[PDB]
Amino acid sequence: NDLRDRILSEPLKHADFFNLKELFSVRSLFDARVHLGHKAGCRHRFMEPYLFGSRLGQDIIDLEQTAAHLQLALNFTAHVAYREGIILFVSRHRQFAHLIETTARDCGEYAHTRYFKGGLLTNAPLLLGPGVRLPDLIIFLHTLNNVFEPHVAVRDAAKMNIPTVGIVDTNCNPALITYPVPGNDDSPPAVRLFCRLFQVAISRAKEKRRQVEALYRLQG
Amino acid sequence: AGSRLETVGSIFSRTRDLIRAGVLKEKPLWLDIYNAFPPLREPVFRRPRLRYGKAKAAVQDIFYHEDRIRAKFYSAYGSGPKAFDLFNPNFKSTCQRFVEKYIELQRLGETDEEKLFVEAGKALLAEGVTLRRVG
Amino acid sequence: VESFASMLRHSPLTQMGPAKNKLVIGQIFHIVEDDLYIDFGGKFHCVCKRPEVDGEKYQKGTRVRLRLLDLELTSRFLGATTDTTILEADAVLLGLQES
């Protein structure tokens, strides 16, 4: 039991323990239309510090802070996937719902791209089952629903003390999101880039966990 | 059980002070990762108040010196013959070639705008492209 | 390393300037019985009606020529705090990659 704490305490002492810096860069985010946001009138008030400027009406999201936030988001999701944490990909957007279900299936994590029920996270012991384990991380691929209002889980996770990583556009509200990533969530390649980044992050985390357990079996 | 208050503080503070008081006997697995790699801004709740009075946004417009020549190109010739290909990252349009000729004709010691404009308009014929002046 | 402002100054969307009456090559990525979802590439996808001539030549993956009118359709109305975004762009169909 004393050596079990070593497996959980090892990755906490390193910054890039899973080597996620090679996954992306500012040029890898630029060609995916990530730096593009909505118009100037659709700008949320809490998006001003995360913006680079306005290119003839359309707001431009800076990519330096985008990558600086994405590094922390990928590190956190890789660490929670390493510590055997339940990860739920939530997104209410009727264009990439199938892509998100397939990404969560290839990741071995869980997905919610359908109509989020009322008491799902709060009234879980009555909505899901008698005793249910709530997800240890919620990754939001679209913060707003089809009504252009903040999602229900973005508030229910903050109510249930569940960490939330979220891709926020120029019209989103990151006040309650634990790890916001200022980028674009409306272009197909921009969505696919984030889905593949989180895919490779969970894959590398589970693989390094299996390797650490392989050496755990040889340490005794 | 826990703290279901969203507007009081952040999830990290609400999970830390509960264990500090001794009501949360089990530490969540994400708390060590939050203590190790905290985000840039603490996820505290802030109400989106409206902006009244003379107060405006803090963002600035994106404009370069090349736009002042792109406006002359789009005012005189309009859209270039080569249509825009937004998929190519290194795509160079006719207006970009025009401003590339303009920035060097500026370095060649010329100040007059007509002597910087119609000479680049004639230099574009050296490559073999067509220009349609919109009357 | 390359800065984001340096790549954005030389990005083609910066070279295009205003999106009014601009010739853009866009690729179709979805097909509806009468509507064609063309991806001109900027932010959104424009939905155009299949013309009468050469209507069978428009398939998924076909690249066509468009005259961009608006990058994103947003407008304000009575008692609205923000705009009502349509999540679409406005452009007309002219041809299919003449070459």
């Binding site: - | 417009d61 002042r68 406006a71 | -």
Partner: peptide
């Protein structure tokens, strides 16, 4: 230190205001 930063200049693409049918008439 950066040279490719946008400069605070006026809008070059400012389209001229539309006129009435009797603008600048008598």
């Amino acid at each position: 230190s950066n040279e490719d930063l946008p400069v605070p200049m006026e809008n070059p693409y400012k389209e001229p205001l539309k006129k009435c049918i009797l603008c600048e008439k008598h």
